[PDB]
Structure formats: C-alpha cells, structure tokens
Amino acid sequence: SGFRKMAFPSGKVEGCMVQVTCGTTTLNGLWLDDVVYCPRHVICTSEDMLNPNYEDLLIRKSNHNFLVQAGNVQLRVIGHSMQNCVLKLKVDTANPKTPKYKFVRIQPGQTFSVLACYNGSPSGVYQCAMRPNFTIKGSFLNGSCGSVGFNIDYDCVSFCYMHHMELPTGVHAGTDLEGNFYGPFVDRQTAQAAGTDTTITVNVLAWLYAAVINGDRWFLNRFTTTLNDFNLVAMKYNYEPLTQDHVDILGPLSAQTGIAVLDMCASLKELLQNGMNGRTILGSALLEDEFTPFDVVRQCSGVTF
Amino acid sequence: SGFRKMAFPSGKVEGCMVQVTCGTTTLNGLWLDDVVYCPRHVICTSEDMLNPNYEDLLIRKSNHNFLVQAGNVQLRVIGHSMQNCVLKLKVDTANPKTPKYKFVRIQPGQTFSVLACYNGSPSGVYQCAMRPNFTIKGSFLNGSCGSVGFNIDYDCVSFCYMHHMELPTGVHAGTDLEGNFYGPFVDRQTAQAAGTDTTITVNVLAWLYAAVINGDRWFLNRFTTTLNDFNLVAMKYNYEPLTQDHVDILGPLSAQTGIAVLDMCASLKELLQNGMNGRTILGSALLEDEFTPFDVVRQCSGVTFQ
Ligand SMILES: *[C@](O)(C(=O)NCCc1ccccc1)[C@H](C[C@@H]1CCNC1=O)NC(=O)[C@@H]1CCCN1C(=O)COc1ccc(Cl)cc1Cl
Ligand SMILES: *[C@](O)(C(=O)NCCc1ccccc1)[C@H](C[C@@H]1CCNC1=O)NC(=O)[C@@H]1CCCN1C(=O)COc1ccc(Cl)cc1Cl
Ligand SMILES: [Cl-]
C-alpha cells in the first residue's frame, strides 16, 4: 500500500542526453539514432533573443558552429535543419543506446516524467502534468533548456516534452519533439504570461479513488449527482468540465471500489462546497490533480518497465 | 525556479536490479560486481514466517536452489552467505553495468530515492525520508521486497535502504545494505508497530528557506526566539528537537537569504500557531518535512529572488 508521486525509471532516457554548444550558448540535446534534437534558440545571442529571425540566423550557421558532447566524446555534426522550434543536428554516429521510442504530443491533464539535465548530465527526475493552461509546474534553472519529458510503455519511450522557458509566475513551457509549443508561447525574450489555470477534474476524481483504495474514506457519502449538476459546480470552482469520456475512463476504479463516478462526484462536490474540515486525504490538505486514472491503476497494480 | 520532490536519475540502479527466486518465493535483488544482495526471507515458506530460524533454513539450501535472473539471462550462483538480515549470493558473472557505489547507513531525517521494482523490473522512482520512528512512507506492493533506496551525489551511488516489509499503519521498514534494520523491527511476522512519529524540524526549516529563495516571504515575522524556547513550543506540536548541529547545518541557507536561523524558527513557531490562512508555501497547504538542507541547496538557485 501507499501512494506517492512516481516518475518512470529514467535510464532509457539518460543514455540519450548530450550537451550542445553554439557560440557562448550551452544547453542539452536529445541524441536518438544519428540526430541530436535541441531548442532552436541555441543559435541565438541575447540581442537575437529580443527579436530573433531564426531563418536568417540559421542559414548564417553551419555544421562546424555546433559542438555536441556525449560524455567526454565529441560528436561530429554533419548536417543541420530546423523543424518548428527544434533544431535537428545530424551527427556521424548513431547513438548505440537509442531505445525503442516515438514522438507523441500530449493533451492537457496528461502526466509525464521530466529528466532535468544541465550540461548534458541528468540531475533529477520528477513527475509533471500538462496543465489546462499549457504550462507545467517544473523545477528548472538556467542551463536546463533541452531537458525532456516522457512516458514509458513496456520498452517504448514516448517523448512528449522539450524544455524552453520559464514564465514570470515560476511555471514552465516547452514544445513537443517536433518543435510545436504547448500553449500560446513563443521562443523569444518578450513579455509572456501563464493564463489563469484550472483544476483537472478527472484527475482529482482519480486521486480520490486512490485514496479509497488506500483506506482513506471519510469523504464518502450517501449522495449521487448528475453530470450536468456537477459540471455547474465545477465551473463555479474553476474546475475543468467533466465529460462522459472522463466517466468512461474512470469506470474501472468505480467498479473496484463500489463508488460510481457520479457517487464520487457527489463526494467531490461536497469537498468543494465545504472544504476538508481540518482533515487530510492521502496526506494532503489540497485536492491533488496531477495523477491521471492510468497513473492510479498503474501504481495500485505495480506495472513494470 | 520551482520546487519539486526530485529523485535521482535511476539508470545506474536499474542496471543492477535482478529477480531472485527460492522455492515458491520471488523478490528483487541488487547485483553489484559478482554479488547479489537480497532480503534473507526469500528462503522462508508459509509456516516459517512467525519465528524463522534463518541459520537452520539456510544450511539446508544449495547454490542451485537460488534462481537469479538478470533480464532474460540466468545467473549461476556459486556461493552464499548471510549478513544480518541480508543474503549475499556470489554469482559467476560480474555485472558489467555496476556503477561506482558505496554502502551508507543513514540517520533519521535523511532522504533518498526509491526505485520500486517487481520481478527484477523497475516500476517507478520517488523520494522518501527516513522518519524519526525509522519507517518510510513509501508505495510498495507485494513483490517489492528487495527494492532499494539510494542517493547519487557526485556520480557515486550510495545505497542506503533495502525494502523488507509493511507495518500495520501502511508505512514501510527495511535495512541498510549490511542487513541491519532501521529501527527496532525484525524480519518476522510477529506483531510489530511503528512508534509515534514526529515532524523533522530541520527539514521544515530548510523548506521554508527554499520558499524564500523562490521568492516568498509572507510567513516571516519581526520576532526571534531562543533555541530552548523554540524547542519547548515545537515539541507541543510533535516536532523533533532542533539541535545546535541542525542550526549549524542551516547556516548556508541562512547566509544566502539573509534570515538568521533563529528568526526562521520564530516564523515556524507562528505558522504552527496560525496555520496558513488559506495560503500555500511552495504549492503546499501543509508544512513539508521531507526536504533536507542539502536537498534544498542541490535543487534551488544560488541566487535568492529578492
Ligand atoms: C533556457 O534557455 C536555458 O536553459 N538557457 C541556457 C543557454 C541560453 C539560451 C538562450 C540564450 C542564452 C543562453 C532557459 C531556461 C530557463 C531559465 C530559468 N529557468 C528556466 O527554465 N530559458 C530561457 O532563458 C528562456 C529563453 C528566453 C527567455 N527565457 C526564459 O526562460 C524567460 O524567463 C526567465 C529566464 C531566466 C530566468 Cl533566471 C528567469 C526567467 Cl523567468
Ligand atoms: C515482501 O517480503 C515481499 O515483497 N514479499 C514477496 C516475496 C515473499 C518472501 C517471503 C515470504 C512471502 C513473500 C513484502 C512486501 C510488503 C507486502 C505489501 N507491501 C509491502 O511492502 N513484505 C512482507 O510481506 C513482509 C514479510 C513478513 C511480513 N511482511 C509484511 O509486510 C507484513 O505486512 C503485510 C504483508 C503482506 C501484505 Cl499484502 C500487507 C502487509 Cl501490511
Ligand atoms: Cl545521514
């Protein structure tokens, strides 16, 4: 028993992290097959960052402008091209530690593991959720750009996030591995802000199921509700709408515990309207929304990679 | 910026995890050089778990009664020995993925990363703290015994925990890698219970410093306290005593933020008295005690957000 915020084992990704330097700028890259992926803002000066023309800055550059270091070995760059906000550096050596992998774009509410890296060296791993406002609540310092986020399914790594920037409120923003930003952000030193965030309702419900599985049941009650009435409560409290698809996804947990989703929604309704009355759930005084239903089922069943 | 419960990258430990089977019992082992370390209760059967005589059970086993599987490869056991509550199986192959490592026995309040493994396959990684009552608050299911806890400061893996059991309150207990239990616990199914736990005061102070580093000052106050008055109050909230060693350890964070340690103690006193009045600190509505001062320096910027 027990329930903890758990990251995937990071070994398969650690063997792909490298250091990329262009001019005075150093950050992290992801070395898969014979390509190194990194943020296209590695080619910029601070002057350029104020208003960069990446097209023009890149055509100006050549292969020899890029220093790629894998541990203590230099990788020779033999080609370069841009895809959206990601730079692709073709190298002369395929990474022998390349795992089975895909590039995937995740949806708000989905979680993933972040491998925080500095100078090509992994430093820490933690779990994040793509927020509804397309930020993540990460922990990133200067030099962390190019750190990646991922999920693992059996032996296949699904890369979903590459880190690019921090916003004034201390949250973080990045791209998928095809260089498309999550959220209405751009890779420029300019005025940008996180939008008002909301709470991921289906994930709070999943975590209430995790709590019941772990013996924490004080918030269960005799009442049930409907999707329509609950969604009016959700809107009042800046919770995301609950869809029928969300209800279907939670179906397993409902069966195991004997609390119908709409039964649990009646529990959540009362918690929103009345608070916790000094009590905790799974050790928390806040309603947790960074566990997906799959995260709960996978942790409560001991799935292995 | 940001502040998260951050584990060490687990790859160096993943390459050491194996599956050990004896009889009908399967659990995880740790393969370092030519030795596999695992909980000695892998040699026990149903009847044996109340009062096992491990010396008598082990003498009856041959090297070939132990099946060790590294991925898809069976490792040949060529010797065995028991050290406290750990079984050491000598195998004929040294692990080519063995990292630089050491064994360290940690003190209550220290943190480490846990690599949860089932059938020698890693499932996830998370941070834990050794509680004052010598338990950890983990996430461990049947089959997780032999999973290990570690730190990786400066590229060397310090193994500090091997998982053996779950107590009735849902918390967890195990040994160092020399097989000595943390706390008064034994590898028997007789009745055992964790003592009353307390909050790790020096870690709550470290986390309040992390909050200041990251730009939050709302909980500070104009007051100070003596160390003895602080401990008289804090113990009324089931907080561990703060020692002069703890004050010294907090020195670097005090220097970076400009807040004297005993001034932060006065902030903590007020927070215990008042609660947070609907506010949060680093995203939490409770006072967090599973970050050490070292953890804060590891993760946080060296420049305070003033
Ligand atoms: C990322 O670029 C980085 O790690 N850079 C190292 C190399 C580099 C790149 C470009 C130009 C010069 C040098 C950083 C990572 C940020 C920094 C702090 N935390 C992070 O996650 N990203 C940035 O610096 C980006 C790029 C332009 C603007 N930007 C921001 O993050 C904007 O916000 C900040 C920047 C720096 C700090 Cl200390 C704080 C903030 Cl809010
Ligand atoms: C650990 O030994 C294990 O993973 N067992 C699998 C191999 C094995 C060896 C010998 C005998 C039986 C099985 C488990 C891990 C526990 C189980 C649930 N979560 C955990 O962390 N440890 C034990 O079962 C130990 C051994 C003696 C008693 N014990 C306990 O954990 C006592 O409490 C429990 C046992 C089992 C369950 Cl499902 C729940 C509890 Cl609270
Ligand atoms: Cl210690």
Ligand SMILES: [Cl-]
């Ligand atoms: Cl909380």
Ligand code: NA
């Ligand atoms: Na109900």
